[PDB]
Amino acid sequence: TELTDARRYWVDVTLATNNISHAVIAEDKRQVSSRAGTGVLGSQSITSGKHYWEVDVSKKSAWILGVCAGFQSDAMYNIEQNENYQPKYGYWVIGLQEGVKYSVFQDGSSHTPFAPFIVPLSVIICPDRVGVFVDYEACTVSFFNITNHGFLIYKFSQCSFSKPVFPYLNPRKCTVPMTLCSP
């Protein structure tokens, strides 16, 4: 009734782009959202077969890289915002922080679902370049230390590949670029 009366004055609101906000306004100016983190995906989904690529992380003091099933579940567990990367949320990633601290991101307790279980990696020869290998049929994601004779850094097995997955890169507040090498 009060609402019904109010609706008589329904107007067509569109948003103004401004240059004071970090807000992201859709092309049609009828939708707005926030940005979270600095994670980016490859442009082509992987839903079959074997895929290899290499990421140059020379001189970077921090990063996250691996494979991601997308940002669909980012909001519910505040993933990018709190670096809550877990296989159960569609992330198979390793990371570096503070120049020398390498870790793998694993599933954490559901009793504390907003924080992952971070496991230190033993890295002796710091990688300038990391190879990432997805075998979608086998459900594995492998990380190779190109700088260290290509020795395996870590391998995720029995991955829950029920959805398309993508290369995942995150420069993680470190201003040094990370680069996809060719081929």
From Swiss-Prot:
Degraded in a proteasome-independent fashion in the absence of viral infection but in a proteasome-dependent fashion following exposure to restriction sensitive virus. Autoubiquitinated in a RING finger- and UBE2D2-dependent manner. Monoubiquitinated by TRIM21. Deubiquitinated by Yersinia YopJ. Ubiquitination may not lead to proteasomal degradation. It is found in: Cytoplasm; Nucleus. Residues 2-183 form the B30.2/SPRY domain. It comes from the Eukaryota. The B box-type zinc finger domain and the coiled-coil domain contribute to the higher and low order multimerization respectively which is essential for restriction activity. The coiled coil domain is important for higher order multimerization by promoting the initial dimerization. The B30.2/SPRY domain acts as a capsid recognition domain. Polymorphisms in this domain explain the observed species-specific differences among orthologs. Can form homodimers and homotrimers. In addition to lower-order dimerization, also exhibits a higher-order multimerization and both low- and high-order multimerizations are essential for its restriction activity. Interacts with MAP3K7/TAK1, TAB2 and TAB3. Interacts with HSPA8/HSC70, PSMC2, PSMC4, PSMC5 and PSMD7. Interacts with SQSTM1. Interacts (via B30.2/SPRY domain) with HSPA1A/B. Interacts with TRIM6 and TRIM34. Interacts with BECN1; GABARAP. Interacts with ULK1 (phosphorylated form), GABARAPL1, GABARAPL2, MAP1LC3A and MAP1LC3C. Capsid-specific restriction factor that prevents infection from non-host-adapted retroviruses. Blocks viral replication early in the life cycle, after viral entry but before reverse transcription. In addition to acting as a capsid-specific restriction factor, also acts as a pattern recognition receptor that activates innate immune signaling in response to the retroviral capsid lattice. Belongs to the TRIM/RBCC family. This is Tripartite motif-containing protein 5. It comes from Macaca mulatta (Rhesus macaque). The chain holds residues 292 to 495 of 497 of the full protein.
